[PDB]
A paper describes a structure:
TM4 and TM5 of one subunit associate with TM1-3 and TM6 of another to form a helix bundle in a “domain swapping” manner. The overall fold of CydDC belongs to the type IV family of ABC transporters, commonly known as exporters.
The TM1 of MsCydD is short and the Elbow Helix (EH) is missing while the EH of EcCydD is longer than that of CydC and other type IV ABC transporters. In the apo structure of MsCydDC, there is a “lateral gate” formed between TM4D and TM6D near the cytoplasmic side. Thus, it is wide enough to let heme pass through. However, MsCydD lacks the whole EH and the gate is largely open in the apo structure. In the heme-loading structure, the two axial His residues are 4.8 Å away from each other, which is perfect to clamp the iron ion. However, in the apo state structure, the corresponding His residues are 6.8 Å apart and they can no longer coordinate to the iron center. (ii) It enters the inward-open apo state of CydDC through the wide-open lateral gate between TM4D and TM6D.
Numbering used by the authors:
A (entry chain B): -5 to 26, 33 to 505
B (entry chain A): 6 to 317, 327 to 507
Write the structure that this text describes.
């Protein structure tokens, strides 16, 4: 009902102006009938205009809320696809978007869109009505109207040399101030504690004079708009008065033209006023939309045969057979998490091609492939709540008891006051780091999966628990599963039948 | 006495001359527009009853001059008011920064550096904005309301009361209701907003291991439900904003209807021109009021900013000797750095001495985005380039300096982002080396360093003859003390 409401508002503005002008003209010339119809007509016109305004406000609020919600949901869903290569780079932007960073689009949907729609509707209709009642005033207003864009373009093209320089000086000096104020505690505990107070003085002076220059340049548009929207009414009044003095034009037509000139010229001023408050919302919307279209997940439908496949890495001469324990060693950060997340098929393999069971990962069917696997990451899943749910998000655990016994989670559940019911905070609050890792082994090692991938399984663990988890992993490998870790410690290194020495570059 | 009023006089009052100048310019512009409307109506009505064209000359010249003056005075008033507000903000920023340079251990450390910027940047902007949206709208609105009520009052003190009541209702109730609705909207349902920081901070750094399982869509549903609940609650709380949005139009309608009703019963008494003026002024006297639907909103934002700006553990005593080496370590939650600054304070003995002995070097030390020479002479500006080069080479930055196109003159745009974290900590260590303080205090100097280098740097720093020799005291608050080492241990609780 956006356009319907705006049409109603435009109609009840123009008709109210016309009726008021006719009433005034009628009851000036005959100061002795017209009180009943005209007054009630004006009252009901104003009443329906008010009701339309209120309904417009409610509709705009609801629409803005819905659009914000849908855009946030779509952004979050789109950014959460595979290929963490882009995720690690754009997670900051995505987190900024779904935060108090999209709430700035509310003014754009509240005070700018209705303003531009009303400017597009009301101005030509009021122009038409004024022309019907009087063509000379309409001619003057028309001559005025395509003089805003001409003068605005002329001003913004003739002086488009000082504005850029002023803006550059503004931003550079502002950055100077921001960085200098950033380091005040660093300069506090040294000899030069108050020697920088003088610098900020003339830095502020120069910054404020530069912003003065840019404000002086940038307000000319408001001056042009005000001057034209006022000179239009001035010239209309002069013309109507001067050509009405020779008894050749009804007072009602003159009053109608005079009252309708401001209605023609107001919505443009309203749009100009409301524009500067909507730049931020448009930028936020553009940033949000720029991070949605690109992701397009691919892959094939090939299905790995039943059992534990054979994984081979020709680039690093690593071929890992089922039923055996494998470890990866090397420096920190040399494409090892990338290698693992590639063999999950999330992203491309940095080190050559990877063939599962003889077939490349690119033809793999990821839906069924992901169901044969127990992926324990560096940071497990810890949703705020209780221990019981946190033990069940990564699918149901068919046999949590024996897995916990093998890893030693019972000593964790035993010391907890409520067993597996103690409340758990965000990120593991109320839950110990090594015992977080233990929860990770509990959720990972217990799963129907012929392929096992683990990143540093013995993090924050003592010797006894390290030996216990290594023995459990060895038993799982002996159960006929491909188990590969990336541990780079002596207990981990001396626990796998094969060692891979992936190197940099 | 609210804190906003206290901060208003605190900010070195804006030199009231240029406050009243902006107020007068705004009043002149809006009054010129109102007088243009009135003179226009009078000119039309006078030209109706056919006169000779003698007075219409002065009326017409007045109309044209008033239009041009309205335009130019509006522009000049905008410029002047912005000038006054931003000058006031700049001087307030300078004064507040001056107050942040006091010897006593004030709140200057109880706050980090990034959010100190997040205060000093936006807060001065808000304080400037309280001079554009409180000077102009309120002052000009009250002056114009008085000047437009008086014009109708002299004609007839019977409908002027209605006009004044209506102007007050619009220009007070409408912005007050808008501000109250806006305030109540952003605080309502402040528990489903927790789901934003639950999900968006859950399924944005945790994506892959959530994707391998089928738990992504469960999270999507479980936060979409609560976001929808928050949206419904916000809509329900902000429903009374539309009433405040629509109030000024109802005000103008009631005003014009009352004006026409009054003019009906007063037309035969007075001349036609006065009747037309009384009928047509009310619809053009509400232009000042519409400039303050956000003045109350700006007042609320400036009040919260002023409150935020107004907002701006004990440790044991350790004896020290000139040349000892300390390896203070402790768990996360112990005042190790607080012990560092306590030792620095007790060594310095507050103000009154020129040769400062102890200076703490915090881990989160800001990096100036200037030349490396300037960035390193902050502790001591009388250090030759040879000393800086030797220090950089001895800390592990000779190869980093060799590749710099400008050598020591590299500007390092972006500050800490221009270099790596390990490189930045190396520059901090070099800066600590350059400083000639008798007692040098370090806060985790082995963090974010190279795996094959951090142990060696810690060993050298805590060695009384490797980097700091003899008469120089080094206190280190680290976390990676070697299992086999020396120097006293002051492990805290």
């Amino acid at each position: 009902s956006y356009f319907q409401s705006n049409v109603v508002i435009a109609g009840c503005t123009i008709a109210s102006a016309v009726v008021l002008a006719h009433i005034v003209a009628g009851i000036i010339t005959n100061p002795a009938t017209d009180w009943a119809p005209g007054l009630v007509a004006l009252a009901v016109l104003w009443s329906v205009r008010v009701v339309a305004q209120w309904f417009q406000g409610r509709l705009s609020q609801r629409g803005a809320t819905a659009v914000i919600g849908e855009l946030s949901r779509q952004v979050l869903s789109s950014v959460t696809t595979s290929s963490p290569r882009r995720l690690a780079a754009d997670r900051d932007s995505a987190a900024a978007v779904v935060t108090r960073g999209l709430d700035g689009l509310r003014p754009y949907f509240t005070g700018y869109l209705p303003a531009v729609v009303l400017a597009g509707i009301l101005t030509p209709a009021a122009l038409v009505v004024m022309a019907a009642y009087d063509w000379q005033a309409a001619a003057i207003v028309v001559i005025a109207l395509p003089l805003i864009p001409i003068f605005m373009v002329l001003i913004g093209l003739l002086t488009a040399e000082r504005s850029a320089a002023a803006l550059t000086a503004m931003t550079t000096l502002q950055g100077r101030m921001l960085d200098l104020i950033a380091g005040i505690p660093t300069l506090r505990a040294v000899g030069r504690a108050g020697g920088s107070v003088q610098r900020i003085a003339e830095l502020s002076a120069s910054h404020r004079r530069s912003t003065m220059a840019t404000l002086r340049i940038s307000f000319l548009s408001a001056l042009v708009l005000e001057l034209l929207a006022t000179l239009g009414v001035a010239l209309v009044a002069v013309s109507v008065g001067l050509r009405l003095v020779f008894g050749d034009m009804t007072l009602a037509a003159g009053l109608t033209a005079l009252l309708l000139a401001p209605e023609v010229f107001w919505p443009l001023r309203r749009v100009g006023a409301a524009f500067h408050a909507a730049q931020d919302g448009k930028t936020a919307a553009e940033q949000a939309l720029r991070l949605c279209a690109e992701p397009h997940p691919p892959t094939g439908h090939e299905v790995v045969p039943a059992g534990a496949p054979v994984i081979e890495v020709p680039a690093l001469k690593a071929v890992m057979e089922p039923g055996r324990v494998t470890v990866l060693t090397g420096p920190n950060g040399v494409g090892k998490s990338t290698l693992l997340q590639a063999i999950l098929g999330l992203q491309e393999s940095p080190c050559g091609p990877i063939l599962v069971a003889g077939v490349e990962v690119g033809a793999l069917d990821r839906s069924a492939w992901w169901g044969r696997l127990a992926w324990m990451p560096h940071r497990p899943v810890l949703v705020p709540g209780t221990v019981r749910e946190n033990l069940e998000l990564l699918g149901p655990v068919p046999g949590l008891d024996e897995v916990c016994r093998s890893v030693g989670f019972d000593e964790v559940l035993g010391e907890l006051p409520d067993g597996s019911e103690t409340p758990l905070g965000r990120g593991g609050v109320g839950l110990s780091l090594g015992q977080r890792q233990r929860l990770g082994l509990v959720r990972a090692l217990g799963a129907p999966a012929d392929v096992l991938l683990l990143d540093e399984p013995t993090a924050h663990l003592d010797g006894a628990l390290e030996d216990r988890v290594l023995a459990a992993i060895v038993a799982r490998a002996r159960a006929g599963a491909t188990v590969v870790m990336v541990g780079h410690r002596a207990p981990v290194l001396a626990a796998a039948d094969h060692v891979v020495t992936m190197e940099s570059s | 006495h609210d804190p906003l009023l206290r901060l208003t006089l605190e900010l070195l009052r804006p030199r009231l001359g240029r406050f009243l100048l902006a107020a007068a310019l705004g009043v002149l512009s809006l009054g010129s527009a109102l007088a243009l409307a009135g003179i226009s109506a009078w000119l039309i009505t006078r030209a109706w009853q056919m006169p000779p064209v003698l007075d219409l000359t002065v009326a017409v010249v007045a109309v044209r001059a008033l239009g041009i003056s309205r335009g130019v005075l509006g522009y000049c008033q905008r410029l002047a008011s912005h000038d006054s507000a931003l000058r006031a903000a700049a001087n307030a920023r300078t004064g507040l920064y001056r107050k942040l340079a006091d010897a006593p251990p004030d709140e200057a450390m109880r706050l980090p550096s990034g959010e100190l910027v997040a205060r000093l940047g936006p807060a001065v902007d808000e304080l400037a904005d309280v001079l554009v949206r409180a000077l102009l709208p309120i002052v000009v609105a009250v002056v114009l309301g008085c000047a437009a009520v008086g014009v109708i009052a002299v004609i007839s003190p019977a409908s002027a009361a209605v006009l004044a009541v209506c102007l007050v209702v619009a220009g007070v109730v409408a912005p007050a209701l808008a501000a109250r609705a806006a305030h109540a909207s952003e605080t309502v349902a402040a528990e489903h907003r927790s789901q934003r920081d639950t999900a968006g901070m859950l399924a944005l750094e945790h994506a892959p291991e959530l994707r391998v399982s089928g738990r992504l869509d469960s999270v999507i549903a479980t936060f979409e439900r609560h976001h929808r609940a928050w949206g419904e609650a916000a809509d329900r709380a902000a429903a009374p904003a539309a009433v405040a949005a629509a109030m000024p139009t109802a005000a103008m309608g009631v005003s014009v209807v009352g004006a026409v009703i009054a003019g009906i019963a007063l037309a035969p008494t007075v001349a036609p021109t006065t009747a037309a003026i009384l009928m047509l002024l009310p619809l053009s006297a509400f232009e000042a009021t519409t400039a303050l639907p956000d003045a109350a909103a700006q007042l609320m934002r400036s009040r919260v900013a002023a409150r935020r700006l107004l907002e701006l553990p004990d440790v044991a005593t350790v004896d020290l000797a000139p040349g000892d080496r300390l390896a203070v370590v402790g768990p996360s939650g112990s005042g190790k750095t607080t012990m560092l600054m306590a030792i620095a304070d007790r060594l310095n003995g507050a103000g009154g001495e020129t040769p400062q002995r102890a200076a703490v070097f915090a881990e989160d030390a800001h990096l100036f985005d200037t030349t490396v020479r300037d960035n390193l002479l902050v502790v001591r500006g009388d250090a030759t380039d040879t000393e800086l080069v030797a220090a950089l080479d001895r800390v592990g930055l000779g190869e980093w300096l060799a590749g710099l196109p400008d050598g020591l003159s590299t500007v390092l745009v972006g500050g800490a982002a221009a270099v790596s974290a390990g490189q930045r900590r190396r520059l901090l260590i070099a800066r600590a080396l350059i400083s000639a303080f008798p007692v040098v205090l370090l806060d985790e100097p082995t963090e974010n360093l190279d795996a094959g280098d951090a142990r060696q740097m810690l060993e050298g720093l805590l060695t009384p003859g490797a980097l700091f020799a003899a008469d120089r005291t080094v206190v280190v608050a680290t976390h990676h003390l070697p299992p086999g080492f020396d120097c006293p241990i002051v492990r805290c609780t």
